[PDB]
Amino acid sequence: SEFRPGLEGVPATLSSISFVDGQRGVLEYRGISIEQLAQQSSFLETAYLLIWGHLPTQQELTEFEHEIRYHRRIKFRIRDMMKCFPDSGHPMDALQASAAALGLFYSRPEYIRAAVVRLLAKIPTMVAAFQLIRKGNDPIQPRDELDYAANFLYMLTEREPDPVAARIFDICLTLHAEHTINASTFSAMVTASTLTDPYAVVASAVGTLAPNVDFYSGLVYRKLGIPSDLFTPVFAIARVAGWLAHWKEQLNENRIFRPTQIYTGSRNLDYTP
Amino acid sequence: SEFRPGLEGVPATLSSISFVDGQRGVLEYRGISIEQLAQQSSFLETAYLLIWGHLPTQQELTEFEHEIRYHRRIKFRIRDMMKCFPDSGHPMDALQASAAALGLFYSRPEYIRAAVVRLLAKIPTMVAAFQLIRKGNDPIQPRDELDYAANFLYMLTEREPDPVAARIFDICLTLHAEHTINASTFSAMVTASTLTDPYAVVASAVGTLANVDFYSGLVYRKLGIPSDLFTPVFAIARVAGWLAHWKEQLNENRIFRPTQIYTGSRNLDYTPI
Amino acid sequence: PGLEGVPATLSSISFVDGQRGVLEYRGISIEQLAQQSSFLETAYLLIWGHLPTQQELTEFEHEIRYHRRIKFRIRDMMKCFPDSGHPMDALQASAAALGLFYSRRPEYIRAAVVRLLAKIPTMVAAFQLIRKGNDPIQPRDELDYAANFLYMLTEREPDPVAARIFDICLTLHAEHTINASTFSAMVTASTLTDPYAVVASAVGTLAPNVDFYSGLVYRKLGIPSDLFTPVFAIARVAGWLAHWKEQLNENRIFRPTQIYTGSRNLDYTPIA
Amino acid sequence: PTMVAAFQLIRKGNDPIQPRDELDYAANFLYMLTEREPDPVAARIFDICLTLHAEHTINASTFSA
């Protein structure tokens, strides 16, 4: 008989998607070094690679980009629900409440193809709307003649940025979008095995997520004009690709997780009034 | 499966020696309560009870006491070797070393009756002797007139006491002679389990060993004994218990044998230096 | 009856699986560890838990080599024993009263292990010679562990090949899991003591399979026929010391309980 | 200097060291105290540092003799 405290060194599944070696430094998403990706690529490229399993042509990329550009705007009942929160909460409580209630509204082959589109589109709008409403003012609407990183930074600032900062923010979003098994990813994989929809899974993963890279991360963020409190929620968009990757293939093996225990306490007693 | 930390609450042995009960205040030395035994009895008359198992007559009592008093003496080889001991070490380590150096001189069906008279007559001489030899003197030698406790006090302080103090000390000794199973008695049991002599048993027990105290401290300080000597005294009495349990483990011969549960590494390679 | 199949601790040091034939010392099977490893390196493994660099092996070897000599009051206390007492009695007295001299009680975790590993074989070799009629022989300063021990015991320094046979037959024994000696070491050490006492009690209770290959390989090298069990203790102290350090972070205590079958409420008269 | 060195050792548990018969005054003393044989340069230096202390005129100790 053996034992394993805190569940260490134990295999849990058979991945394919990312590899790190750590003897010289080899970090690759699906089999490509990190610098070939970080010099001449854009975010939707990386995310199509991660999710779907290959690289796209010209047609399919232009179609994905237009579709994601059509679904960027929030409805009016949802703003009418946000208006009543207290103005003393946090951003992670706002994020769990909104991501959870967005599954009341639309839920029921396209099934796998649309949910990914809405989740990729509407998150940064919600983050920015509550940033404004927390202060007395109104929400700002989205433009239709901009691109992902610059559009988000405008909705937060109401000042239109020059292309250099847009490109820099975009690749700093490229180099965070994946890593291998840790707490949050095991929690998404535990939840998603009872055959559920992506809104509960992301609700639960963002429930448990709440020199090193941190030095320069802090500085290059502080200069672009982003408040302090909004540090960590900026993470959770960069990463929302990783988690969806997993939901797709853990839905293939139809098992359920359940270990057992080693009872260690007082035995056979009797009911004393 | 199951697991208990500290064997805490697992039955280990059978017994017929003592009984305790703590919701009402009951404590029995073979079924004769503590009050009517501390009212008109002495240490030797009890000790016969615990070890052998039934109240004695008068003829045997005379024989017993006469014999445990014609053997209080020692040779010059033990005293000559006692001198080569340091003079800045605790008296407890000297107790252990001397109890384990009795074994060389005396060793190898009246064999379980000689051992008791020897290990019961020959403790006080030696603890007092080291008390004197530590700070530069010569040790006293006992006369054939005084009693057990009277003679201990005379050897320790050189000036005779009055009889009332002797009587009080004899009570103080017949209180501390037994209780239920503890750490030290557990050590003596697991070491006797494989048929070895009584001396080794007493050395390992003393090694393990290093309300009522709140007043015993006072009663001892009054009579003129230092602080360094509060613990060896509490050992003199107690031997009369360890002995008894040795005597018991000899009827069944079955040797203690538990197991473990691992949680370490498995399969590795010796990497060259 | 007799504590069978009952889980007493959680440990990590040695693993043995019977029915399929295996044995490991911290995760490395034994037949791979015998052919390219010496003794002191194996003690270092079984104590701290990680094989060492080059400089650390060097400093351990030197530190051991400087602590083999033995002051003159200890010699002068050994001369009074009698010439008719067993050798295991000499070993209990010696290892128990070596704790009167050096007891301060990781500035006090790394000296004790050094002296305990240094000054045992000297004592067993001396009392051999003193019991016989003549006085002890000092240690050299140009040999290695098993060569030095064999020269102190017999005076005629051996061939290197015999040294190496001795050294691997000294690593074959250093470890094995729960038994009566080891359980008594832990029971003693649970109350937070220092080593010179737990070793005294553990050598108190020790007093074709491999009881046919030991006999002969021992009898050829030139070893008397009574020092058979004491030489075994030289091999085993390593094992025991690991335990005193593992069981010092749990802090609990031992206390099992008993059942009763005796008569109650009798009537007192001392004169029976 | 034999007496001074013998008590320096016995004060510590060990034994006294004996003298050699193939050395000179300052180096011999320094060996009996160290058990490590010294090179001639330090021997000569110690010797002349012993030369320049061996006399002075009337003070307490000399009046007492």
Numbering used by the authors:
A (entry chain Q): 5 to 112, 118 to 219, 313 to 375
B (entry chain C): 5 to 112, 118 to 219, 314 to 376
C (entry chain D): 9 to 113, 118 to 219, 313 to 377
D (entry chain H): 133 to 197
What does the article say, verbatim?
CS catalyses the condensation of acetyl-CoA and oxaloacetate to citrate as the first step in the tricarboxylic acid cycle. Using cryo-electron microscopy, we reveal how the fractal assembles from a hexameric building block.
We were led in this direction because fractal complexes are pH sensitive. Indeed, an increase in the pH from 7.5 to 9 led to complete disassembly of the structure into hexamers. This behaviour is driven by the residue H369 in the fractal interface, and changing it to arginine abolished the pH sensitivity without compromising its assembly into fractals. Instead, we solved this structure for a point mutant (H369R), which we generated in the course of a structure–function analysis (described further below).
